[PDB]
Paper text:
LpxE is a member of the lipid phosphatase/phosphotransferase (LPT) family, a well-distributed family of lipid-processing enzymes also known as the integral transmembrane branch of the type II phosphatidic acid phosphatase (PAP2) superfamily. This family is characterized by a conserved tripartite active site motif of KX6RP---PSGH---SRX5HX3D and activity independent of Mg2+ or other cations. Removal of the lipid A 1-phosphate by the membrane-embedded phosphatase LpxE strongly protects bacteria against host cationic peptides and the last-resort antibiotic colistin, significantly dampens the host innate immune response, and dramatically increases colonization and survival of Helicobacter pylori in the gastric mucosa. In order to gain molecular insights into the structure and function of the lipid A 1-phosphatase LpxE, we identified the previously uncharacterized gene aq_1706 from Aquifex aeolicus as the gene for the thermophilic LpxE enzyme (LpxEAA).
Numbering used by the authors: 1 to 165
The structure:
Amino acid sequence: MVIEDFALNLELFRLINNARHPLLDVFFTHFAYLGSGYVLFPLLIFLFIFRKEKVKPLILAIMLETVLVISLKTFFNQPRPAILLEDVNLLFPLHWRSFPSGDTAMAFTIATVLSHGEKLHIKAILFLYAFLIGYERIYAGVHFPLDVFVGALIGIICGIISLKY
């Protein structure tokens, strides 16, 4: 069962993965680090200093999304675009566990928990960051639009669930 092989998913991927430029390649390569788990420890330390009330919600939300993301990654074991499709523009050598996008889920988890109760321009900054991570995964050729949409969905839900608890 390959859930990534429907017309809307493949046509959307081609539109993003083919609209390229060397400056986009550099920007998204530099930007990808902000969607990895390597920002979590630096971020949590700064939260502990300036926004300690957000530390516990973010930790619980990241735990929720991480468990949910690795579970779906293991059960579905979907191929990434470099395996399913031909002539994929690849920025990172990733091939498997496509569904869903963990970087997108974490980024939307960060944006959901940290936007709560904050000024409007802070919400726009965080959710533009989350959007660019999701766009970066498709531009890098390592994810399908289905992976980043569900990943974003997981991140938003787990962030909201954590804020309520």
